[PDB]
């Protein structure tokens, strides 16, 4: 229905705003673009589902997220990919892991404060009807 399309449009607006706020945070610069396949050719071998904030925006605009749960699956993927690819005790790996966990925690905290639970519930119910 047009009302349901209005709901999903509001969801996309909400998700773009949250993503932008993550993307402008200096700590998360490393997650703003795909890992460059030409400069880091091993990355695509190891990490089976690359994800980054630019790719998240593209997915929002492609209507790939019909719930905030599905969005958060991709934020979770940004985080878990960083933990997997950079697992060692050296400070470079520890820094990227800390940033990744901070990205995840920040996204969840913004959503906790700003997503109305009944809005998310409606989204889930429209999604499950399709």
């Amino acid at each position: 229905s047009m009302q349901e399309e209005d709901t999903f449009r509001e969801l996309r607006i909400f998700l773009r705003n949250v993503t932008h706020r993550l993307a402008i945070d200096k700590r998360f610069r490393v997650f703003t673009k795909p890992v460059d396949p030409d400069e880091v050719p091993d990355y695509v071998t190891v990490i089976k589902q690359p994800m980054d904030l630019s790719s998240v925006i593209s997915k929002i605009d492609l209507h790939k997220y019909l719930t905030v749960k599905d969005y958060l699956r991709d934020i979770d993927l940004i985080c878990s990919n960083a933990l997997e690819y950079n697992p060692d005790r050296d400070p470079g790996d520890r820094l990227i892991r800390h940033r990744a966990c901070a990205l995840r925690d920040t996204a969840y905290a913004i959503i906790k404060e700003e997503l109305d639970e009944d809005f998310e519930q409606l989204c889930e119910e429209i999604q499950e009807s399709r």
Binding site: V40, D42, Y43, V46, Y85, N86, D88, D93
Partner: peptide, 5 residues
């Protein structure tokens, strides 16, 4: 890990 070069 393998790093980003």
């Amino acid at each position: 890990g393998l790093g980003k070069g």
